[PDB]
Design a binder for this molecule. Structure first.
Ligand SMILES: [Cl-]
Ligand SMILES: [Cl-]
Ligand SMILES: [Cl-]
Ligand SMILES: [Cl-]
Ligand SMILES: [Cl-]
Ligand SMILES: [Cl-]
Ligand SMILES: [Mg+2]
Ligand SMILES: [Mg+2]
Ligand SMILES: [Mg+2]
Ligand SMILES: [Mg+2]
Lengths: 228, 228
């Protein structure tokens, strides 16, 4: 429904929606921007990520509330409503994965862009995995793993160890290991090696880049504290 | 789209949506419950009010953000997006007013129910007034006034001065006077008389009712402090 709006107007309205904390509108404006077919700039990639992370973040928090109530109960209403929220969440994940597959990833040739979109692919498969069960859960877990792994391979070859997207990728792949793949040792090892390699590279950074990197290193630290 | 769901199931799902902070779902479930045609209990009236107050509250906060940006700017994008939010807000207000008019108010014979719904009618016209301009603004302001005034007349005849809905009605009618009707003296007079008459009636209340009443008296107090 955004096909008649100018790309630049969609981007401007995404930024306005962000200011107004209207994340569903923001995601719809950024979906329309992507569907114009042009590659996204660094700023525009961040708008896309913020919009959907806020939308899906709300759905995940709601799904968790409903799942807890449902598990305690174990009428059809709690299950029915958890399933409705779950379906809506899956639809948002499938929408984001669709944008990545058509055709953000294939056109992304620079390390910054390709790693950013593959991290997103890992994250949205991870969200699908959280609500999945059975073997269904297995192929979804492997899709999240594969995307994270390709992103990690490129980030290690192409980016310094303090690059914020490299750090955030490692952070989320470590959460995948801990929370999804039942590999807490792999999670802890990855977060520790990532933290230590970034610490050794901080001396190369300006004040502002130091601020950006140490913020994400603190997130790695917070997880290690929680997990150990 | 709720016509096939049992009334009791809609109410149960409204309560679940509230727990999950899913207020748009909560409002839709309560709209479906109202549309069953039966009167609402005290608990159900509160669910209806909470759902829509949260939905419209989000829209008002967003509209305010966008209006501020628009006024500072004075391309079409900020105006266009403020108008989109404004239209959505008006649609939610019209939906609530429609439920009150078809047929909650006319079937409400007890003071508690009638005052509750007339206060809601005042509030949703007040929200329409906030975004209205011109003469358009005048008929809307008069509709909010009329609803508040009928509610006040019944509350003074039928309820004690500490009744929480009577207090909340007076609180919101005083905000109407201050913020909409440009009658700050009427606002201050109403909040002060309401506060003083409730204070004189507190001695009649249980511990729990005392807690309920003094909470709203503090809201009256907070406004008087802001306005004086
Ligand atoms: Cl979350
Ligand atoms: Cl449902
Ligand atoms: Cl390429
Ligand atoms: Cl508000
Ligand atoms: Cl718009
Ligand atoms: Cl009646
Ligand atoms: Mg164009
Ligand atoms: Mg390219
Ligand atoms: Mg029935
Ligand atoms: Mg009746």
């Amino acid at each position: 429904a955004m096909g008649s709006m100018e790309r630049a107007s969609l981007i401007q309205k995404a930024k306005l929606a962000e200011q107004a904390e209207r994340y569903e509108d923001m995601a719809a404006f950024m979906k329309g921007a992507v569907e114009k077919g042009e590659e996204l700039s660094c700023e525009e990639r961040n708008l896309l990520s913020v919009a959907y992370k806020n939308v899906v973040g709300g759905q995940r928090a709601a799904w968790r509330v409903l799942s807890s109530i449902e598990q305690k109960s174990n009428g059809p209403e709690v299950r029915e409503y958890r399933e409705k929220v779950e379906t809506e969440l899956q639809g948002v994940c499938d929408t984001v994965l669709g944008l990545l597959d058509s055709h953000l990833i294939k056109e992304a040739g620079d390390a910054e862009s390709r790693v950013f979109y593959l991290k997103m692919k890992g994250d949205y498969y991870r969200y699908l995995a959280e609500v999945a069960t059975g073997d269904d859960k297995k192929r979804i877990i492997d899709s999240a793993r594969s995307a994270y792994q390709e992103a990690m391979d490129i980030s290690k070859k192409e980016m310094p160890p303090t690059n914020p997207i490299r750090l955030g990728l490692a952070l989320n792949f470590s959460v995948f290991h801990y929370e999804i793949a039942n590999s807490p040792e792999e999670a802890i090892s990855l977060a520790k090696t990532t933290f230590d390699e970034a610490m050794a590279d901080l001396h190369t950074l300006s004040e502002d880049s130091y601020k950006d990197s140490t913020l994400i290193m603190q997130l790695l630290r917070d997880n290690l504290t929680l997990w150990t």
